[PDB]
């Protein structure tokens, strides 16, 4: 990046929504146009109902973009309070991104956390039917590929978070040739709702995730390996419950004793059949004994307990793992009696 190869200051603007890909490469003037910061402002003024969609020039040429994010404040909650949500929102979002930076990017945790919490920009949609505003931190630059990799981490945060804003994060915007609507323009030639700026920031060169100007108080990082090298996580989905708490719930359902309890760890619990003896009638089917043992399987965030061979002979029980963060706290507090 530095400054020598800072060509990522131009604005690739797309006119229409859903531009065909057969014309983007040819750079048809009827669909695309190159601009600078000053010329973009004038083009907005002279056309009152023009629609512009900011996008990258070329992926392999200049992949460095600002860390930009989208939130759709929606649903039916009466507590729509703004300020405490946004300030709290910028906290957990700041932690996970820094946590991902120290894990899969080799960056200093405190340097990342300082730059992003320091300065940021914020917009707002005037549509009262459903609120949707973008957030762009200015002093955090990275390649686009790490955003695609971070997609899984961001989605996991949204599922088990507190604030409605971080619960409704939009992670679909991280893709190839992403498009972000420029501030102050319509979406379609019919709807009049536009993104209005917020104080104190006013100039347009801080509302674009392609306009990059690395000064002396900025931090940059990226992925070390190549994108086509990712290995998925293990069978467990770090984010819900420690392993030993899950099995004790499983053992609670089984009235009998697990003869092979010990050989279950964080990776072999989906393949080792639970060979159980039946001193008492089975807790599931209320039968004397069984021809085959029971097994475990993890799908969607639950443990499906069933029996192989003739599965129709025994009923299927489902063990949940809540998945919330504060409910685990409440369970632990009530545990200590």
């Amino acid at each position: 990046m530095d400054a020598a190869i800072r060509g990522n200051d131009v604005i690739f603007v797309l006119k229409t929504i859903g531009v065909p890909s057969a014309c983007r490469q040819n750079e048809d003037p009827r669909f695309v146009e190159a601009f600078k910061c000053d010329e973009l402002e004038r083009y907005i003024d002279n056309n009152p109902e023009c629609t512009l969609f900011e996008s990258l020039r070329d992926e392999e040429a200049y992949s460095i973009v600002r860390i930009f994010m989208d939130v759709d404040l929606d649903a039916c909650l009466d507590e729509i309070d703004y300020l405490t949500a946004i300030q709290d929102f910028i906290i957990e979002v700041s932690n996970c991104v820094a946590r991902f930076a120290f894990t899969e990017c080799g960056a200093i945790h405190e340097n990342v956390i300082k730059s992003m919490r320091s300065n940021f920009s914020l917009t707002k949609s005037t549509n009262r039917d459903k609120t949707s505003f973008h957030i762009i931190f200015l002093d955090t630059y990275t390649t686009m590929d790490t955003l695609i990799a971070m997609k899984r981490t961001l989605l996991e945060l949204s599922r088990s978070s507190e604030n409605p804003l971080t619960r409704s994060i939009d992670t679909a915007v991280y893709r190839r040739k992403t498009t972000l609507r420029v501030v102050g323009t319509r979406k379609n030639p019919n709807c009049d709702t536009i993104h209005v700026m917020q104080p104190p920031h006013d100039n347009i060169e801080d509302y674009l995730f392609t306009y990059v100007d690395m000064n002396n108080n900025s931090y940059y990082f990226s992925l070390q390996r190549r994108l086509e090298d990712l290995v998925p996580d293990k069978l467990w989905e770090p984010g819900f419950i420690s392993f030993e708490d899950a099995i004790k719930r499983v053992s609670k359902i089984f009235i009998n004793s697990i003869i092979n309890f010990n050989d279950l760890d964080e990776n072999n619990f989906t393949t080792v059949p639970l060979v159980i003896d039946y001193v008492t009638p089975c807790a599931l089917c209320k039968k004397r004994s069984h021809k085959h043992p029971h097994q475990l399987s993890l799908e969607n965030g639950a443990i499906r307990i069933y029996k192989t061979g003739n599965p129709h002979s025994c009923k299927v029980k489902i063990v949940p793992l809540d998945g919330n963060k504060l409910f685990n706290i409440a369970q632990r507090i009530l545990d200590t009696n």
Binding site: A75, C76, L77, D78
Partner: protein, 112 residues
């Protein structure tokens, strides 16, 4: 369906009876019960509790003129309708509604 009484209370019309509560407003119940008689594009907005509260608040700002109740002296109101006394016929539903009857016998009427 919703009316304002002279004492400042609101009377609603559900279950074929002019019932009213000073502590529990039945306006939301009436809205959710009547949601079936609207076009399909209007029903989806009557599910959020916030939206029903908004509708109730908007309704409360439209009742300006008071209405007096219990003006007909020859009607016997039951729980599921009002029985006329001029000819012995018994009305129910929308028919036994124009007569703003507040009190009632307390038991349903069975014609059999």
């Amino acid at each position: 369906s919703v009316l304002l009484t002279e004492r400042g209370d609101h009377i609603v019309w559900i279950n074929n009876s002019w019932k009213f509560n000073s502590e529990e407003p039945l306006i939301t119940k009436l809205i959710l019960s009547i949601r079936h008689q609207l076009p399909k594009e209007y029903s989806s907005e009557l599910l959020c509790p916030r939206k029903r509260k908004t509708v109730e608040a908007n309704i409360r700002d439209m009742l300006v003129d008071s209405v007096e109740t219990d003006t007909y002296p020859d009607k016997l109101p039951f729980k599921n309708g009002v029985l006329d006394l001029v000819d012995g016929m018994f009305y129910s539903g929308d028919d036994a509604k124009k007569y703003t009857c507040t009190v009632s016998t307390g038991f349903k009427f069975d014609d059999t």
